Amino acid sequence: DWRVLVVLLPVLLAAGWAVRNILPYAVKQVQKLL
Amino acid sequence: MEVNQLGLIATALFVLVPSVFLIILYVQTESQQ
Amino acid sequence: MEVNQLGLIATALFVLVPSVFLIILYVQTESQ
Amino acid sequence: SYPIFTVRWVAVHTLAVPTIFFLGAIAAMQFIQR
Amino acid sequence: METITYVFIFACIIALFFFAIFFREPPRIT
Amino acid sequence: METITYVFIFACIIALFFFAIFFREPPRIT
Amino acid sequence: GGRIPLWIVATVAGMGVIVIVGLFFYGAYAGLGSSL
Amino acid sequence: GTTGERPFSDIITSVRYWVIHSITIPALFIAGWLFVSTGLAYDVFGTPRPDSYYAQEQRSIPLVTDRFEAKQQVETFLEQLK
Amino acid sequence: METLKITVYIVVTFFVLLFVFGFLSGDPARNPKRKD
Amino acid sequence: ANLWERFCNWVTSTDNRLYVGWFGVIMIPTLLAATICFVIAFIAAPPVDIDGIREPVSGSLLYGNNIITGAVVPSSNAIGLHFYPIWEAASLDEWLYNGGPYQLIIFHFLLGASCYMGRQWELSYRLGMRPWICVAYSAPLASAFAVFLIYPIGQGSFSDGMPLGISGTFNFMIVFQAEHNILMHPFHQLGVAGVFGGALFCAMHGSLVTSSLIRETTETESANYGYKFGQEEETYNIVAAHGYFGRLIFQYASFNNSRSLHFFLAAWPVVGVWFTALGISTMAFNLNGFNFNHSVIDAKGNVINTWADIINRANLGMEVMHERNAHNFPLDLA
Amino acid sequence: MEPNPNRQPVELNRTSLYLGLLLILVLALLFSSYFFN
Amino acid sequence: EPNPNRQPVELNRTSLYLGLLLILVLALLFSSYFFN
Amino acid sequence: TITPSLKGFFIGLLSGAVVLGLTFAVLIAISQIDKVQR
Amino acid sequence: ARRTWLGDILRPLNSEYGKVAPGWGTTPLMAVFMGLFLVFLLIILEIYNSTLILDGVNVSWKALG
Amino acid sequence: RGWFDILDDWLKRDRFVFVGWSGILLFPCAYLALGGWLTGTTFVTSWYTHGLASSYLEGCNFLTVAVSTPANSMGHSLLLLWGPEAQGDFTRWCQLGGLWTFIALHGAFGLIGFMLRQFEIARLVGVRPYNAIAFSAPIAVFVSVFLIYPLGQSSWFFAPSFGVAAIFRFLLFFQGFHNWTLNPFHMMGVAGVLGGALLCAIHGATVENTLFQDGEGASTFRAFNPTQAEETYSMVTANRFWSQIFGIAFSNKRWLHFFMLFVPVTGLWMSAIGVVGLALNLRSYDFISQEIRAAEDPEFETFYTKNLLLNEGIRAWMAPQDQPHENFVFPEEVLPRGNAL
Ligand code: CLA
Ligand code: CLA
Ligand SMILES: C=Cc1c(C)c2cc3nc(c4c5[nH]c(cc6nc(cc1[nH]2)C(C)=C6CC)c(C)c5C(=O)[C@@H]4C(=O)OC)[C@@H](CCC(=O)OC/C=C(\C)CCC[C@H](C)CCC[C@H](C)CCCC(C)C)[C@@H]3C
Ligand SMILES: CC(C)=CCC/C(C)=C/CC/C(C)=C\CC/C(C)=C/CC/C(C)=C/CC/C(C)=C/CC/C(C)=C/CC/C(C)=C\CC/C(C)=C/CC1=CC(=O)C(C)=C(C)C1=O
Ligand SMILES: CCCCCCCCCCCCCCCC(=O)OC[C@H](COP(=O)(O)OC[C@@H](O)CO)OC(=O)CCCCCCCCCCCCCCC
Ligand SMILES: CCCCCCCCCCCCCCCC(=O)OC[C@H](COP(=O)(O)OC[C@@H](O)CO)OC(=O)CCCCCCCCCCCCCCC
Ligand SMILES: CC1=C(/C=C/C(C)=C/C=C/C(C)=C/C=C/C=C(C)/C=C/C=C(C)/C=C/C2=C(C)CCCC2(C)C)C(C)(C)CCC1
Ligand SMILES: CCCCCCCCCCCCCCCCCC(=O)O
Ligand code: OEX
Ligand SMILES: [Cl-]
Ligand SMILES: [Cl-]
Ligand SMILES: [Fe+2]
């Protein structure tokens, strides 16, 4: 029902925000794995 | 009091048998030395 | 048979106490 | 150069993420009335 | 008979205390 | 309990016979 | 690296706990579970 | 001494850390909050609301008394509030 | 009963005087390092 | 050659097989009195009217008890907190009926135990040790003071102090729960954490040290013979033990400072047991465990029971049954 | 036939005797009441 | 300060066998009278 | 014949297999990428 | 050591001490039977438990008639 | 150099949180037991199994929340989510008490996990496995109390419920119904737990008050170095102190630390045994000789008879609300009560 996206929206937005601030150095790390 | 008559011997053997076992081992340890 | 109830403990100790004396004396004899 | 995403990273977030969410649910509860 | 038994055991424990304390293996250094 | 007691003591004696015979101090010539 | 000093992070975290637990004791007297 | 992970005291005094987590921590708090304020927590877990432990003129517990019909029994009790 | 009472008063007094007078008899000095 | 100074020298001598000391000059007679009276009363004392209602309770072996059920019974509620020495009774018969031995034993014992604690300080000073072992003992000592003296003072009667017996002890702890809800009291919860944790850390520490013993022996000898009394080298390897325990949990949850570690061992149970002694001492003045009886009700006002209300049903059954002939009025106010 | 090489002496020191007698006596003291019942 | 009068004591295996036999036969003889 | 609880049994059994295999697939993957240098 | 008739006859059965098949040998096959045995015990446990209910399997004393 | 060895390589890397092969069992199961408890105590009722509120969501606090046992009518059902009781419905699963079996069973395999981890790390680090051996006592307690005990009874309903006050109710149930304080296996457990805490305190206090002066500071903690050879406190002075104070002292550091393992581990094992007895209602409830005398002699009274009157009160006043499936109706006139109260 609708209450599920209301609850879930701050969780996605939060993870979206972290994904974008960290992505540059997460790319680097992955490359260093050989 | 009406107590289990066999309580006495149970208790006597309960004390005597394991004690006697330890005393036997102690004394023959002392005579080694 | 309405025997004496203390007969059991008296017989039990009669055997045990002196037998244990002898066994103590004997084991510490062998271990020297 | 330190990695960002590790087994440690996962252990930490495996506990911290639900904890904060649960603390939010429990704080709302203080305002429930019968 | 049960009173005698209880007291007898307690008395043996007190006698053991005496030997444990005054007739212990003396601790010796190094 | 007395039957058991009599039989027990008799059984112990038969065991002693066995050890007395087969585990004697062997007699030796010095 | 070490910009936000540690004593300040400790103080702010600290008060954040005091606030949450405060609210939990306040709710012992209000609403559900308050006997009222 | 160390197994090569970044030290925690370095992470939590770092600006990038708090840039991400000043968003992620409140968002989670608000998510859990909405989980309750919307009533969704009640419906997911089956927890009675303050108005639905008993029916209006009832004082019996709606106790599960059957193993294999137990799911049906709970549903029966729940209808007796609607 | 009074013989008993008086006997106990005397026994207890005697022991308490030993205690007070013993700790007043230079007890700080009865250690193995710095005696004064 | 002075007589007093010779006696002082013997009292405080570190060469006596048991240290006497000035604290021992009081401890020795008081503990001997309490021990001799306890043993005599446990075996042969007649029934004692603990609750003042002329309903005497039989505590001793010769009057039909065993080790588990026997007890020196507390003094009569008719006496309250009045001092009841032998010489205040018209006869020994009276003194025995009314519970005189309990007073004699607990006063002598509490004095002798207090001095035991001081004796622990005193010999530490004669040996040039650090002084705080006695502080560790103050935890068990405060606990005995609480159940033998403090709780009686607050409730007004040595008849509500702890019987000196095994079943008597359980009676005291069931009635305490009905009158104070001690389990819902946080200081008893810290006591359980002090005692559970102490047993945990006892086993932990024993097992970690035992785990890192240095091979000094063959498989035919007890490893205990790998340590010789008074050797200078440690006998286990704290770094191997820190390296095992730091990996079982994580590194910074493990001690490699042995001083910090043993201080932790000292302090955790001692402090937990301080709190639970303080729990009894403060429930002595009726500041009781949390009461959540009927704290949850529904939208209409129906009570919604919780596990605390179920505790309360049990507390009620203890309350209504205890000292079943002793209450004439509807509130058990003490 | 050789005599057996695997035989070993056994020991119980005095402290182990005291500890074990104490264990037995205390166990007796605890359980005796349940044996008489 | 050890006492010079101490002696070890001995019971050989034959003496054990003879002794155990004496006690067991005495027990067998007297047990009927103990039970009565 | 295949009763409802025998059906749940297989559901329970397939789910376990999934969780277990999924777990081991991931672990073998990572172990292959991030090897120890010897 | 003493030789005996019976010893000489049983000798071959206690003569391969230490002998192993190389590497992993039959381990994968062992694993398969372990797996089957677990499901087998699961079924047996859950029938006794009445978590697994089967047509014609009445887990009651009244399965004696 | 095949996949198994490569995975072994990786599971056993030295990292902040060691994983190991045992981690595969341990970490899922521990996290799920712990999440089930936190989840249930925050959100899940006991209304249909017990007639009790038991979550923060319902108005309970930290002392009264619980994950409560399933209804008595579930018997010993595993209560799998996909089983015939809940039939895969998560909500009904929660309401029938499925989280109790969930926590209990994941908890048991986590405890196994944890002890395998103590074995695994002990072997890699090169030390003897005594910490694992000691942890056998916690496992014995858990299985005997949470599993063996309710399996001998009518249902999981009479197991402990996972909650602070709920466990208090379990304490009092055992007093009133089983007279468990009278049980010598509990008494040996009491001695081992209280003996352990004593040994913990007295050993710490002794080490700290027979320290060697190894630095110049008033804080004596600095003057230790974990790789020093030398003992950091005097066993000789400690031994003299206790010999003179108490009559006897430890003289062997190894025996000392083994005894600290031995005492609480053995006590916990003993209490587990007595609980196994209580699974069968094989209680140490009475002394026959006492009852015969008291039945015939109404002036005969001991602390033993006084405690059974309290038990009888506990049973009758708590059973109706604690065992609701039984529909006990005790009219006021049948409740045991002394005068006035
Ligand atoms: C090591 C991890 C682990 C372990 C030991 C357990 C153990 C358990 N879980 Mg938990 N669980 C886990 C991880 C784990 N779980 C994880 C990661 C999750 C999140 C997804 C859950 C979520 C979960 C839920 C939601 C529930 C359990 C339940 C259970 C219990 C029943 C398990 C069962 O019957 O499986 C049956 C399955 C197996 C034993 C697997 C066997 C597979 C074999 C090896 C192969 C057989 C062949 C295969 C099927 C072939 C495929 C055929 C196909 C092609 C058609 C048991 C105590 C239940 C419970 O607690 O009840 C109260 C329950 O309801 N678990
Ligand atoms: C002087 C008071 C005293 C003392 C010292 C004890 C001592 C004991 N009691 Mg007894 N008790 C007493 C009075 C006392 N009792 C009284 C007056 C009663 C009323 C009759 C009882 C009733 C009672 C019952 C009913 C039971 C005991 C039990 C026990 C034992 C508990 C063992 C233990 O630590 O379990 C604690 C639990 C464990 C050790 C199991 C596993 C724990 C795992 C490892 C937890 C891991 C936690 C994990 C990391 C997650 C944590 C996070 C979470 C907290 C947030 C122990 C021998 C129990 C017993 O005998 O069990 C065999 C038991 O069932 N007692
Ligand atoms: C209530 C008392 C008590 C608790 C809480 C406790 C706790 C613990 N003991 C451990 C260890 C030990 N305990 C030991 C001896 C003892 N432990 C004792 C008593 C206890 N021990 C006693 C008395 C002794 C003396 C014999 C030893 C020797 C060890 C260890 O070596 C070990 C350790 O490392 O200590 C530092 C730890 C194991 C960690 C683990 O398995 O993680 C994994 C977590 C898992 C698998 C989850 C288990 C879930 C449980 C079983 C069921 C669910 C529980 C709910 C989530 C919470 C319920 C709360 C309500 C009931 C109120 C953990 C901190
Ligand atoms: C829908 C879907 C799929 C859902 C998602 C679900 C999902 C997939 C789940 C799986 C998640 C996943 C794969 C796993 C990650 C989960 C995760 C990280 C699990 C968390 C598990 C967890 C609960 C762990 C338990 C925590 C635990 C109990 C630790 C407590 C720490 C603690 C109390 C330690 C005691 C330390 C202490 C304070 C003192 C020291 C003790 C003591 C004195 C010892 C004595 C001593 C110590 C020494 O040190 C040395 C030297 C010596 C001499 C010595 O005497
Ligand atoms: C009161 C009881 C504890 C006594 C104190 C403990 C001893 C102190 C430590 C000794 C040396 C350090 C002295 C102070 C220094 C110190 O102790 O600092 C604590 C430590 C600091 O380490 P950092 O890596 O930040 O940096 C290294 C620093 O030590 C240098 O400044 O931080 C942590 O450990 C974070 C804890 C959260 C970790 C989350 C873990 C994830 C949980 C996973 C589940 C657990 C595993 C499962 C088990 C099965
Ligand atoms: C002011 C006077 C103080 C009063 C003194 C009272 C004496 C009490 C001390 C006990 C003496 C017996 C010690 C036995 C045995 C003894 O001699 O052991 C002595 C033993 C010596 O240890 P060591 O380290 O020397 O031994 C190492 C190796 O020999 C291993 O073999 O010390 C310990 O093991 C102490 C730990 C057990 C301590 C147990 C104490 C429990 C006492 C409580 C018993 C109460 C039951 C009473 C019910 C009625
Ligand atoms: C069950 C289930 C599951 C799982 C789940 C999970 C796993 C969960 C988790 C969850 C979580 C994981 C939770 C958490 C929470 C937390 C919390 C709730 C916390 C809190 C805490 C606090 C409150 C604290 C505070 C304090 C105090 C009080 C004082 C001291 C200090 C401090 C600050 C600490 C699944 C899905 C599989 C499915 C089936 C069912
Ligand atoms: C050994 C590891 C075992 C892992 C067990 C994890 C189980 C995963 C949970 C799956 C639950 C789905 C059940 C819900 C659907 C059931 C519907 C039905 O009964 O037909
Ligand atoms: O005395 Mn003993 O116990 Ca304290 O309250 Mn009131 O009083 Mn009696 O009653 Mn409840
Ligand atoms: Cl009473
Ligand atoms: Cl009154
Ligand atoms: Fe130590």
Side-chain angles (χ1 to χ4, degrees), chain D residues 4-30:
Chain D
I4 297 176
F5 292 109
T6 64
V7 162
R8 184 184 90 181
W9 186 95
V10 173
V12 168
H13 290 83
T14 269
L15 304 161
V17 167
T19 289
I20 305 300
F21 173 101
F22 269 60
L23 292 176
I26 302 167
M29 288 173 212
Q30 306 317 318

Side-chain angles (χ1 to χ4, degrees), chain J residues 265-284:
Chain J
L265 291 187
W268 176 280
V270 160
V271 170
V273 171
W274 281 342
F275 274 113
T276 197
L278 288 181
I280 301 292
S281 292
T282 52
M283 280 170 277

Side-chain angles (χ1 to χ4, degrees), chain H residues 26-81:
Chain H
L28 292 168
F29 190 88
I30 272 287
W33 185 296
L34 300 153
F35 190 45
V36 159
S37 55
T38 56
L40 185 65
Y42 291 110
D43 294 331
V44 167
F45 290 105
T47 296
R49 278 177 183 88
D51 64 335
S52 37
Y53 282 88
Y54 297 93
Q56 199 37 63
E57 283 321 311
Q58 171 208 322
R59 274 192 210 82
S60 65
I61 310 299
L63 208 59
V64 175
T65 67
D66 195 81
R67 182 174 168 170
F68 303 109
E69 300 289 285
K71 157 175 218 302
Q72 290 61 64
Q73 279 189 346
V74 178
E75 272 141 31
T76 299
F77 302 140
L78 292 183
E79 284 292 294
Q80 295 177 344
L81 321 167

